[PDB]
Design a protein around this nucleic acid. Structure first.
Length: 114
RNA sequence: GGAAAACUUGAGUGCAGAAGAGGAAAGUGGAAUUCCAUGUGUAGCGGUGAAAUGCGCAGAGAUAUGGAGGAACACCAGUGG
């Protein structure tokens, strides 16, 4: 089980959740990013993806996987403070992938915020 | 003004080629919001200028080889055509 996997996050503008999994997704543990008492304008922190990143990473305890190769699929304030700060656990982050959804003009997008 | 002609610039009928988002018809595939299901797990997830309604204990989202739908299809994109 150990030494391989994907630290599958999707770092949104609020509540960048972290789900560690394998290289074929099975989600050994995940972490809700509001687990540090972040409720309103608070999960958009560096620290929502610093310690709640390792509230499932340091508390993995199931595979003991060490090579993580974290993957991000969205923009957020805790994005650069997620891939750095999943390695706040010190879990040898190796291969970050910017495989984000880029639709070739996918649908009809919503309205401007006045 | 009418009567008898011509020339071709102006226009049309020729010939050699350039380009395309020009209108009506057939294909190839991507990515996304929504759903139902696996794995997964349990405290929050979403939304907030400020919090909350809500959606959460059914697993809500999550997460990938991979299951689908609606609809269009960034890149070539321009005082371009």
């Amino acid at each position: 089980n150990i030494e391989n996997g994907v630290a599958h996050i999707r770092s949104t503008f609020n509540n960048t959740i972290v789900t560690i999994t394998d290289e074929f997704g099975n989600a050994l543990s995940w972490s809700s990013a509001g687990a540090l008492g972040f409720k309103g304008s608070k999960k958009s922190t560096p620290f929502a993806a610093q310690m709640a990143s390792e509230t499932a990473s340091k508390s993995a305890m199931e595979h003991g996987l060490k090579t993580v190769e974290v993957t991000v699929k969205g923009p957020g304030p805790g994005r650069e403070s997620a891939i750095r700060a999943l390695q706040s656990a010190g879990l040898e982050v190796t291969a970050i992938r910017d495989v984000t959804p880029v639709p070739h003009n996918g649908c009809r997008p919503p309205k401007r915020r006045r």
